[PDB]
Design a protein around this ligand. Structure first.
Ligand SMILES: CC(=O)N1CC[C@H]2CC[C@@H](C(=O)N[C@@H](CCC(N)=O)C(=O)NC(c3ccccc3)c3ccccc3)N2C(=O)[C@@H](NC(=O)c2cc3cc(C(F)(F)P(=O)(O)O)ccc3[nH]2)C1
Length: 523
């Protein structure tokens, strides 16, 4: 859906194009008048005929001055308009995309489409090129015909400085990282790169100029620049930018043959690195030095470091919009619960068909902050999330959660995707909602004491005394889920009753779904 700010920008660019086109027509008229003045001056060098020709030349030069004074001020007004629209385009519309990319990287909505910004940037770039050519024409015209108090000699140096500044800054802003450094075997985990592993990245120039096809050589490097590890990019670290049908005519450069190796003559998962891209543009007498960099990258040595490395990327991209804060973990910022809850639900909605529900997020809030009702005014630190182990446990909240995400993705995906997994429910709440329900009613949830991840089912029944009993089964491990599906385990589960007969204590899946109707399709 196109916004009000974006529709106003589309008209503001169209108005710039109309102004540029209107000045082109004035430039033609001023050139033809000067060419006539130049011709008539150089030629015919009663006696009244010479006097009449002299009056013609004076009138033509006075008219030349007025047309020049008009064009110069019309160009000054055009540049001011260009400056405003460029600030809206680069500092506002482009920055929003950069933030939308940070969010998409960490599982957020996958918007981040360049086609509209490429169309707007190209339009502004083409308009600025015609303006630069009009300022070049004023220089050419002045050289041939000038006079004391000529508006070209006094205002052209400022007009030239203004358009050159505009065009350089637009070219520099258009050089973006379309696809952030990522390992192809871990597409759901970008900005985490293991040494010796082939990784890919992609860059794009949003100024759609066909002149530049096969002209820009993109050089890629790491650690360009206290006590931090230094690395080198090995493989094919140079790529010629080209227009493809696959890109829809867009100028881009994809690096697929890259690897990191430590250079040879703070904790590893919190150390950040920047992958830099460089090129030089030579366009009609201008040398524009383009330089862009990736979002901070965590460099790992073993794949066991992947969970803590991903948490550092989650923290960085959730809390800051700054694209180069390498010292972020020297003093990491605090997050709100609503910020964290959004990211945690993104971890599930990017890997599965279902994110985290309100009830699942509430029980997750209580696990980190303790009892309460409203968690919107609560704060979560890096220590409570990843750096330090949970209160009374030998593992951090993130390690416990990452093992659940993996359990869902690899072992119980189909059940999670259909909504048969209660997942996160406190011992007090599960006993509460089951207390009212008939005997044999059960819910599926994850283990809180299991580091590696465990799945369980909590059920309700009545003893001979009539007292309601709520029990959970010993959590089923990943190893067990590799032999039997959780659905087969639910159906096959038997208990020894009072009559000493093996019976299934499971009848209905919460709230009232008969077990065979919900889990039969998976056996
Ligand atoms: C007390 C009771 O009424 N129960 C029945 C009896 C006991 C004893 C046997 C055990 C059981 O049913 N085991 C399962 C296998 C479970 C597994 N993880 O592999 C089972 O099917 N047992 C069979 C059997 C038969 C042959 C060979 C092996 C096992 C069985 C069947 C019939 C009779 C006996 C045994 N069986 C149980 O799990 C009983 N419950 C527990 O022991 C238990 C629940 C629980 C919950 C958590 C948590 F919520 F996730 P957290 O957030 O981490 O705190 C953590 C630890 C936990 N332990 C349920």
């Amino acid at each position: 859906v196109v916004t009000e700010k974006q529709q106003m920008l589309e008209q503001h660019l169209q108005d710039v194009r109309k102004r540029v086109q209107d000045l082109e027509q004035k430039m033609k008229v001023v050139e033809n008048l000067q060419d006539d003045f130049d011709f008539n001056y150089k030629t015919l060098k009663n006696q009244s005929v010479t006097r009449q020709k002299m009056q013609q030349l004076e009138q033509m030069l006075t008219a030349l001055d007025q047309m020049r004074r008009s064009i110069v001020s019309e160009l000054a007004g055009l540049l001011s308009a260009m400056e405003y629209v460029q600030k809206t385009l680069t500092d506002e519309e482009l920055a929003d995309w950069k933030r939308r990319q940070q969010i998409a990287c960490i599982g957020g909505p996958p918007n981040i489409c360049l086609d509209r910004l490429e169309n707007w940037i190209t339009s502004l770039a083409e308009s600025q090129l015609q303006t630069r050519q009009q300022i070049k024409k004023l220089e050419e015209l002045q050289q041939k015909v000038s006079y004391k108090g000529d508006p070209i000699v006094q205002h052209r140096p400022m007009l030239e400085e203004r358009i050159v500044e505009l065009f350089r800054n637009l070219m520099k802003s258009a050089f973006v990282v379309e696809r952030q450094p990522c390992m192809p075997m871990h597409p759901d985990r970008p900005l985490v790169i293991k040494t010796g592993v082939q990784f890919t990245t992609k860059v794009r120039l949003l100024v759609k100029f066909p002149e530049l096809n096969y002209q820009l050589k993109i050089k890629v490097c790491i650690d360009k620049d206290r006590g931090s590890r230094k690395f080198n990019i090995l493989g094919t670290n140079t790529k010629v930018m080209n227009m493809e049908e696959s890109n829809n005519g867009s100028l881009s450069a994809e690096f697929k043959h890259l690897t990191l190796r430590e250079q040879r003559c703070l904790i590893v998962t919190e150390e950040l690195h920047l992958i830099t891209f460089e090129t030089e543009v030579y366009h009609q007498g201008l040398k524009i030095d383009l330089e862009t960099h990736s979002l901070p990258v965590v460099v790992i040595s073993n794949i066991c470091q992947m969970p803590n490395a991903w948490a550092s990327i989650l923290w960085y991209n959730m809390l800051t919009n700054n694209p180069k804060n390498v010292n972020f973990f020297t003093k990491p910022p605090i997050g709100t619960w609503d910020q964290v809850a959004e990211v945690l639900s993104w971890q599930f909605s990017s890997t599965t068909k279902r994110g985290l529900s309100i009830e699942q997020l509430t029980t997750l809030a209580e696990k980190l902050l303790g009892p309460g009702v409203n968690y919107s005014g609560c704060q979560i630190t890096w220590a409570k999330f990843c750096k330090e182990n949970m209160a009374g446990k030998g593992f951090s909240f993130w390690v416990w959660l990452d093992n659940i995400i993996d359990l869902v993705k690899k072992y119980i995906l189909a059940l999670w995707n259909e909504g048969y997994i209660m997942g996160f429910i406190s011992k007090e709440r599960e006993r509460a909602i089951l207390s009212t329900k008939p005997p044999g009613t059960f819910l599926l949830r994850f283990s809180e004491s299991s580091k590696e991840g465990g799945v369980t089912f909590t059920w309700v029944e009545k003893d001979i005394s009539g007292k309601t009993q709520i029990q959970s089964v010993e959590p089923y491990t990943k190893q067990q889920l590799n032999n039997m599906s959780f659905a087969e385990i639910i159906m096959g589960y038997k208990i020894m009753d009072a009559t000493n007969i093996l019976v299934s204590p499971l009848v209905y899946l919460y709230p009232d779904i008969p077990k065979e109707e919900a889990f039969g399709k998976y056996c």
